[PDB]
Amino acid sequence: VELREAQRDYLDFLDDEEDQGIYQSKVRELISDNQYRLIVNVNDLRRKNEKRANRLLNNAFEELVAFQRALKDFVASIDATYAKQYEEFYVGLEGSFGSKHVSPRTLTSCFLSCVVCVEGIVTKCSLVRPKVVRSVHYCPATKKTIERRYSDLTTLVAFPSSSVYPTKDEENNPLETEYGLSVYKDHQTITIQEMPEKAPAGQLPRSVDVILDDDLVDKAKPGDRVQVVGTYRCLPGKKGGYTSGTFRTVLIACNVKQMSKDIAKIKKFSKTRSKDIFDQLAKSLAPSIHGHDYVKKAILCLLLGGVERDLENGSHIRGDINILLIGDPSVAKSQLLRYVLCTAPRAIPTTGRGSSGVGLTAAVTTDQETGERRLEAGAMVLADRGVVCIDEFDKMSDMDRTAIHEVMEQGRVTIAKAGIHARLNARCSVLAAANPVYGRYDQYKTPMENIGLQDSLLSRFDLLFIMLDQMDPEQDREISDHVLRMHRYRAPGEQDGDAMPLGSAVDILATDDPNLHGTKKKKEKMVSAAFMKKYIHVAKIIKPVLTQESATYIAEEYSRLRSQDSMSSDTARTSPVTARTLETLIRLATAHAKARMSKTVDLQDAEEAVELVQYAYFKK
Amino acid sequence: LKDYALEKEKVKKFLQEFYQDDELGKKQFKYGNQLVRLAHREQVALYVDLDDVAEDDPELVDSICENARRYAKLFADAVQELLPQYKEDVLDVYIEHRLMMEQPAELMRRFELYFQGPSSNKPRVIREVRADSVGKLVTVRGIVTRVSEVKPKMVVATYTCDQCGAETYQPIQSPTFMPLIMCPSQECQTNRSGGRLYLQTRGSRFIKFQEMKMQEHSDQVPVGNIPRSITVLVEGENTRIAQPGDHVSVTGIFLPILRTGFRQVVQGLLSETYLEAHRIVKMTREELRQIAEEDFYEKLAASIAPEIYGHEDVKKALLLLLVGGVDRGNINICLMGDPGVAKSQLLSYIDRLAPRSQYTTGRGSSGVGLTAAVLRDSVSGELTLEGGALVLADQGVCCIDEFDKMAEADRTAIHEVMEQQTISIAKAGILTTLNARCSILAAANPAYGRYNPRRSLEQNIQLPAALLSRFDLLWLIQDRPDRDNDLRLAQHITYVHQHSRQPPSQFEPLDMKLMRRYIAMCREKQPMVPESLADYITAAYVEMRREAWASTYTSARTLLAILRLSTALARLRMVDVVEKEDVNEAIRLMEMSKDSLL
Amino acid sequence: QLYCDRYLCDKVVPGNRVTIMGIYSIKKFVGVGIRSSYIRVLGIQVDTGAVSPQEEEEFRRLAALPNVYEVISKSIAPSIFGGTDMKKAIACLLFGGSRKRLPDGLTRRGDINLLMLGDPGTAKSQLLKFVEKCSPIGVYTSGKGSSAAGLTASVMRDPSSRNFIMEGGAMVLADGGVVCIDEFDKMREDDRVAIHEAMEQQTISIAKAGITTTLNSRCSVLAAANS
DNA sequence: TTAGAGAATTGGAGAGTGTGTTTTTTTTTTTT
DNA sequence: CACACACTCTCCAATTCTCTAA
Ligand SMILES: Nc1ncnc2c1ncn2[C@@H]1O[C@H](COP(=O)(O)OP(=O)(O)NP(=O)(O)O)[C@@H](O)[C@H]1O
Numbered sequence A: 001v002e003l004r005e006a007q008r009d010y011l012d013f014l015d016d017e018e019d020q021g022i023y024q025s026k027v028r029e030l031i032s033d034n035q036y037r038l039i040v041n042v043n044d045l046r047r048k049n050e051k052r053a054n055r056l057l058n059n060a061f062e063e064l065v066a067f068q069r070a071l072k073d074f075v076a077s078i079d080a081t082y083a084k085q086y087e088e089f090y091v092g093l094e095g096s097f098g099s100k101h102v103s104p105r106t107l108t109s110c111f112l113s114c115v116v117c118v119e120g121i122v123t124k125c126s127l128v129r130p131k132v133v134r135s136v137h138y139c140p141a142t143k144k145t146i147e148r149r150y151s152d153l154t155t156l157v158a159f160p161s162s163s164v165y166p167t168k169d170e171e172n173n174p175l176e177t178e179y180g181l182s183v184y185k186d187h188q189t190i191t192i193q194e195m196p197e198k199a200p201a202g203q204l205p206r207s208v209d210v211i212l213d214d215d216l217v218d219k220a221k222p223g224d225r226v227q228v229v230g231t232y233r234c235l236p237g238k239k240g241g242y243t244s245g246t247f248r249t250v251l252i253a254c255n256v257k258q259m260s261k262d263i264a265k266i267k268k269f270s271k272t273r274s275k276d277i278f279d280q281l282a283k284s285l286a287p288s289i290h291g292h293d294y295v296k297k298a299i300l301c302l303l304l305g306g307v308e309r310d311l312e313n314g315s316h317i318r319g320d321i322n323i324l325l326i327g328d329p330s331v332a333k334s335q336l337l338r339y340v341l342c343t344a345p346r347a348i349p350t351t352g353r354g355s356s357g358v359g360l361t362a363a364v365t366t367d368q369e370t371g372e373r374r375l376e377a378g379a380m381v382l383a384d385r386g387v388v389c390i391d392e393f394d395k396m397s398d399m400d401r402t403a404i405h406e407v408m409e410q411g412r413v414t415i416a417k418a419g420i421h422a423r424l425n426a427r428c429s430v431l432a433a434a435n436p437v438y439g440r441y442d443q444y445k446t447p448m449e450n451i452g453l454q455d456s457l458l459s460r461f462d463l464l465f466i467m468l469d470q471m472d473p474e475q476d477r478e479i480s481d482h483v484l485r486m487h488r489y490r491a492p493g494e495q496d497g498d499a500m501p502l503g504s505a506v507d508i509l510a511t512d513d514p515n516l517h518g519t520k521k522k523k524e525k526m527v528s529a530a531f532m533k534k535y536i537h538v539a540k541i542i543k544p545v546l547t548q549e550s551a552t553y554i555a556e557e558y559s560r561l562r563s564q565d566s567m568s569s570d571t572a573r574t575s576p577v578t579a580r581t582l583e584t585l586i587r588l589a590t591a592h593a594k595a596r597m598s599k600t601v602d603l604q605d606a607e608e609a610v611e612l613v614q615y616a617y618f619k620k
Numbered sequence B: 001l002k003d004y005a006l007e008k009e010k011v012k013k014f015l016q017e018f019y020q021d022d023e024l025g026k027k028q029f030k031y032g033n034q035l036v037r038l039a040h041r042e043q044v045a046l047y048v049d050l051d052d053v054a055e056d057d058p059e060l061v062d063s064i065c066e067n068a069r070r071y072a073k074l075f076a077d078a079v080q081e082l083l084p085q086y087k088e089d090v091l092d093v094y095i096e097h098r099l100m101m102e103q104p105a106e107l108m109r110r111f112e113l114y115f116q117g118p119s120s121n122k123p124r125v126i127r128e129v130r131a132d133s134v135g136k137l138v139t140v141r142g143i144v145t146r147v148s149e150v151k152p153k154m155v156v157a158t159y160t161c162d163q164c165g166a167e168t169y170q171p172i173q174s175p176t177f178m179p180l181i182m183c184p185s186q187e188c189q190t191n192r193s194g195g196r197l198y199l200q201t202r203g204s205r206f207i208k209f210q211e212m213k214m215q216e217h218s219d220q221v222p223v224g225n226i227p228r229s230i231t232v233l234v235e236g237e238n239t240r241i242a243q244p245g246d247h248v249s250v251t252g253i254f255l256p257i258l259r260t261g262f263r264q265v266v267q268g269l270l271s272e273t274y275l276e277a278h279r280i281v282k283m284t285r286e287e288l289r290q291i292a293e294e295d296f297y298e299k300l301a302a303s304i305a306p307e308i309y310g311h312e313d314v315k316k317a318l319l320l321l322l323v324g325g326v327d328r329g330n331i332n333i334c335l336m337g338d339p340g341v342a343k344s345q346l347l348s349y350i351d352r353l354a355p356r357s358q359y360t361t362g363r364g365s366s367g368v369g370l371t372a373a374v375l376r377d378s379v380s381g382e383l384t385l386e387g388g389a390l391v392l393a394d395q396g397v398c399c400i401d402e403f404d405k406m407a408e409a410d411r412t413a414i415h416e417v418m419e420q421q422t423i424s425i426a427k428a429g430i431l432t433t434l435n436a437r438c439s440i441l442a443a444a445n446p447a448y449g450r451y452n453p454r455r456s457l458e459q460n461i462q463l464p465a466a467l468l469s470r471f472d473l474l475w476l477i478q479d480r481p482d483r484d485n486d487l488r489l490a491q492h493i494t495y496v497h498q499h500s501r502q503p504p505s506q507f508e509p510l511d512m513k514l515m516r517r518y519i520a521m522c523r524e525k526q527p528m529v530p531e532s533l534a535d536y537i538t539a540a541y542v543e544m545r546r547e548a549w550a551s552t553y554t555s556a557r558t559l560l561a562i563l564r565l566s567t568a569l570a571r572l573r574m575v576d577v578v579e580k581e582d583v584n585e586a587i588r589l590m591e592m593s594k595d596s597l598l
Numbered sequence C: 001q002l003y004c005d006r007y008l009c010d011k012v013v014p015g016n017r018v019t020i021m022g023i024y025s026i027k028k029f030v031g032v033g034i035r036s037s038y039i040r041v042l043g044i045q046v047d048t049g050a051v052s053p054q055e056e057e058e059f060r061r062l063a064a065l066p067n068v069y070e071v072i073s074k075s076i077a078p079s080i081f082g083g084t085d086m087k088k089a090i091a092c093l094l095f096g097g098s099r100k101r102l103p104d105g106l107t108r109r110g111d112i113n114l115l116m117l118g119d120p121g122t123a124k125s126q127l128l129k130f131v132e133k134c135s136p137i138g139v140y141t142s143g144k145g146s147s148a149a150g151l152t153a154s155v156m157r158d159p160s161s162r163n164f165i166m167e168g169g170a171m172v173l174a175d176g177g178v179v180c181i182d183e184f185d186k187m188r189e190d191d192r193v194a195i196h197e198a199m200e201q202q203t204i205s206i207a208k209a210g211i212t213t214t215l216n217s218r219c220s221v222l223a224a225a226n227s
Numbered sequence D: 001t002t003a004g005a006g007a008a009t010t011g012g013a014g015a016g017t018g019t020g021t022t023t024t025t026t027t028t029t030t031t032t
Numbered sequence E: 001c002a003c004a005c006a007c008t009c010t011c012c013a014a015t016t017c018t019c020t021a022a
């Protein structure tokens, strides 16, 4: 009875035509785009009505139905017929929610019926299924049509309606359902898990169930790091005539943001200002790790990648670049993997002893929303159009590497389990790290015996690097100097004797608030990590094309490499040069062209790519 | 709102009055003609096109697309009411006798109507079938993952009463129903006669019913997602159009499955869905003179994989593999090499060219193996056999990469195929035999590194001789540097990357459809050997065995191999008797395959 | 079975030793007249992190006095004669270095890993049994009694839900503490391989049964072995 | 004396109410 | 939950008891 005042407040807030026109413009954009939820910033609601903002965040359900009714009134005033074209117009909330910013761990029972913004990683999603909200029925015996609304505990009003349809009797006559005139909404359930690094000590990551409706269902898949704004509620699990107090709790989402996914003109100017920007990016790739320049260049090529061809005959040429690092203990292989996991979009960690062929590809699991079993994606399927980092790769079982073979060879994985027979897309770059046999590389043995992997598997990697703990005194001097400098570093936003805090939630707005070189050092103008992330994100899309001169030089130098294999030492060749090496040359030249943002693979790209191949094939 | 009686009258008007000038301007009333055919029972299914409906009422097309089930019923009722105007087996007999009793509309209805979807509607993917499209006519593309056998679905049940001799009828809509027990007729109820009802399967209307499951095309799925699936329920003449592994586009109504009883309270307002299928669509003498040119053998060998230079005699052997010998008959061959030697590329070409084929790895695949496998489909829980590379390749050729890396189960399965061309598999502890007569095209690696000719093939490739001797030809695709050929190969690869196509080769490959026609009519020829050529076979075989003994993988299977290859070349020549050139070709192909191995 | 309520939730974690004050009672939803029993907790006492100011003054005095290093070394395993340098190494292990997160996001471990190879009957196992007792978080394992899953993490099907769930091994149970692996040489090679990520990167990356995560293993490995 | 019409007693038919409903990881022993 | 066991409860009517005529 009292909610008309709140509805008046929200309608007054939405009618921005008087002062700034922000939200009337947003509603107009909603009408033009044919959407039916408005994205409202609670910061603006605070600026115009602090009282109503506090009430909204602390009394979420009643306030939200008031807000949605006000939005329906406003969109009707702007365009009445469009207001009739949808059952109801939702509102999704963004901005800063104060103390309501939580994780799945800190989302305790005291947050019930409040708007909360939960940050976490998606572990699983149920299949989208329709949900009836209003069913229309027709009586042939009466030539009359009737309607019934439907609600359940998930809906904001939360009354449980009877599940069944009117069936054989209205006016004691048989009805039949008008499915077309009825209206259904999409329904999906996901599970948001705590960020694994932020758990306290030995506690495993906790999780919270989330319910998506209508247009939100597409906006999250497993492995995504998301921020979900919604209302927290308990669902009573009555037996019928009896219940235990234990109720499961869910988050009915009103808005979902991909917090890790995501201006170009300054990048396209920087590629002109800089001289051979590939070198600067490669040097600035992992600042904490000294040396390994060619490996860093190869990793940058892996990050950028070639362009995947589709041929007129329907065959396709795989565009991803696969790198295998083999080397002694303590030569930063694991650290290079960790940097790639931090810097790249959708990079999946994996280690040889802690993974299985099932977990790498797909597993049959029961969806508890229904009980039916479905495929749940493994590591390389999650890594599609991304990277997968495999540490301790020499420690995998052969049956587990059978899974990797198809992924690397064809960019897919074939599955035949449960009721499903399917070719899943697993188009990912593999960055594998391994130790040689006997732990430490043996100079008195051939590379094919230091490398315990089979030649069939090794053929699938574009580049194979052997990196050794050579105890040269000058190299040791520079390495130790860099290591001790890194260990001496302390951040500016940290006191002089602090131990760094164990993880806790520190994100307090749905969008980042502080919105290219490093400033400390003089030599070579090191690039910052954020700019490198943005530049790689832009440069991956350029898609350059071969030129006649670069093609000619690649062919000539490949022929030289092949003919050089005639007299090259069979006892010490890293890997045999073949057409696969030529594919590697083309992909690396394309990646260098992407780094330059050139749109044409030039002779410079060919020169750098074939230099990298020469180093990887004929240098330790 | 809608006045469905007026809609029915407008539908009658459309059916009566539409014409489309078919058969080059004859001004045919297509729907009147089909109404005559339905009335005469010479036709049962009527696919009305909403593109035709659009040409006189777009609003009616919109109403159909928005409320498809209602308008399906209205169109069917209008057609049934109009059949007497155009009316110039067992259920027919029953309808005749019920007309005699008159002298249950759904029972007397002996036709079916479907909407062929309008071209303005784009064909969706399965993932794009949102909840807003429930109860609406949608067009969906996908791969047919699995199809059930055709089963009878009760449409109108018919009962007879023992005491009062009266027929009673029970129309069926839901997937489940209550069968009637006691007689409802007033002469039974008022007399309290205790009469009961017996179902008459003979005099009750069934319909063909088939359940299948579509699945997203793999190259249309979003990046990080499992392909989605949709259950499709198929009725009447739409049944048996689809098969597993087929690519289809289905026009149908997206509807919810309304379960009964305990599942209702469990599921609540949620519901599973199915697609009610209305339409399923599936995605030379001059040429014989070109074939007549005596170059045709080498012309075809050149047309085989111009992307690969050399190995022309291997290409000829591959041609004879696709041709096959006299019916035994499969020319199984094996070609070993190092990784990356263009061996996989050659096998991929044969898989693309061949009409029935498969391409797989000997190892360890997480998919269905070389043998078929039994899936569970746990929403139903009914275990069903599916796939198997050998089974899917049955009448054709199965290509196996890294044959050396096969498991022992796979090796025994291929051994069984080589022996008797069928395999054994268990569904639910019980087991069956499953048929596969495919030719095997095997590619294998050395056990370690590049091939060394100083070591024998079985010791190098690490395969048992019991399997390795089965193949008629053994080739070794060795790769070594060669400056000009490497440069030519590099120019080819660079052009392929630069233009996404093969460069011009100073000749035109024959069309693969024409090659398929050629090998088909070739395989339809059935040669036989004369006795003089048998003597020639004997002399050539004994001399070849002298050479093999002096340098041992020659036996009676060698004589049978050269006979198979000679009959294959006789088929290639398209003549029903072999000749000296056939035996010469077989002998030299075997000899030079051994030379390639040496 | 215990039932914790309101502010008793998350007052204790697995591996802790507690005294529980509560009400022994039946659950109230083989045989007929049987009811399952549990304790309704109303008081938790950790028998052994919020220090009192008096304790903080004592700790500051201990840090301030000049011979605290020798005092700690003498305090470690006082029943064990000799081995003073090994006790000093154990002191360094117990206090540990400083974890550091560098500008590019790479993290360096502060934990110190200490192996004690040597002759039998030399108090190595007793030093491990002291460190398990003395460390704020401490887990004692026998190498021969351990497995790769049991050390790092196990994936098992939840019986009541049919999902696959994670279970913390010794290195997860000891996160923020010390793992005492006694008779370390008796492990099979494939099981010693499992701890390589957790010893250096201090993480346990898992990809099994469709669940894919990176658990934390910020712990020190103290190992004992014979020749 | 024997048989049919009006009144009294008890069986049970029917309505209402309450209740019941293969597929992955990890271990262990033995097979080679 | 909507479709089946098991039990209670209500009023209809089926058969006998008693009075009268043939
Ligand atoms: N060139 C280097 N610059 C900086 N730190 C380095 C360098 N080489 C090794 N380190 C350090 O050595 C430690 C071990 O690095 P890590 O990546 O595990 O080496 P690794 O090559 O993977 N050896 P392993 O894991 O035993 O196969 C880390 O703290 C690195 O930072």
Ligand SMILES: Nc1ncnc2c1ncn2[C@@H]1O[C@H](COP(=O)(O)OP(=O)(O)NP(=O)(O)O)[C@@H](O)[C@H]1O
Residues within 6 Å of the ligand: C079, C080, C081, C082, C119, C120, C121, C122, C123, C124, C125, C126, C127, C224, C225, C226
């Ligand atoms: N220096 C010592 N001071 C006191 N007790 C000692 C000393 N050395 C050995 N012991 C005792 O010897 C017994 C065995 O000690 P233990 O801890 O097993 O040594 P250990 O080297 O680990 N044995 P092992 O497992 O065979 O290598 C215990 O009772 C110890 O207390």
Ligand SMILES: [Mg+2]
Residues within 6 Å of the ligand: A330, A332, A333, A334, A335, C200
């Ligand atoms: Mg490492």
Ligand SMILES: [Mg+2]
Residues within 6 Å of the ligand: C124, C125, C182, C183, C224
């Ligand atoms: Mg010991």
Ligand SMILES: [Zn+2]
Residues within 6 Å of the ligand: B161, B162, B163, B164, B165, B166, B183, B184, B185, B187, B188, B195, B196
């Ligand atoms: Zn009857």
